[PDB]
């Protein structure tokens, strides 16, 4: 079953640095394309950084360039977010998301999300 | 006496040819029946050999 846990969750002296794990299983991760999503209490889902199914490339958001990293490995199937320097906005609920895949051929900036 | 005059063959009647089979096919349906299609912009661009 298509089933993803989300660990490594805490609270952390700000400007520190922790790493984010997510497990996959079900399917394997180097077919598909993830999103992680934060969400604030009181506030809306604010999208923080993807990866790609083939990993040439990686975006984030402008709120979070140069201070996150993203990594994936697909010989244990398991995602790591690289999170450091905290800041106080950072306080939101993460989550680990599946996006379409190249075994179904679709155009640029592809579409995802669909499951998570 | 004794003379020679001209020479005699036969002809060959048909003809046949032969190959080393035929097997070794490329692959062609997976692409005219393919699950999906490329979009109008981009396109795969698939080796045959």
Not at chain 2, 9 to 16: A, D, H, N
Request: proline share 4%; with cysteine; charged share 20%.
């Amino acid at each position: 079953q298509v089933q993803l846990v989300e660990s490594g969750g805490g609270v952390v002296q700000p400007g520190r640095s922790l790493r984010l794990s997510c497990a996959a299983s079900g399917f394997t991760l180097s077919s598909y394309g993830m999103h992680w999503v934060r969400q604030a209490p009181g506030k809306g889902l604010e999208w923080v950084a993807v990866i790609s199914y083939d990993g040439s490339n990686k975006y984030y958001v402008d709120s979070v360039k140069g201070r996150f990293t993203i990594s994936r490995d697909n010989s244990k199937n398991t995602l790591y977010l690289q999170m450091n320097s905290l800041r106080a906005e950072d306080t939101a609920v993460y989550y680990c998301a599946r996006g379409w895949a190249y075994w179904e051929l679709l155009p640029d900036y592809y579409y995802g999300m669909d499951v998570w | 006496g004794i003379y020679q005059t001209s020479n005699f063959r036969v002809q060959p009647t048909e003809s046949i040819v032969r190959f080393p089979n035929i097997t070794n096919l490329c692959p062609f349906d997976e692409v005219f029946n393919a699950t999906r299609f490329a979009s109008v912009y981009a396109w795969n661009r698939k080796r045959i050999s």
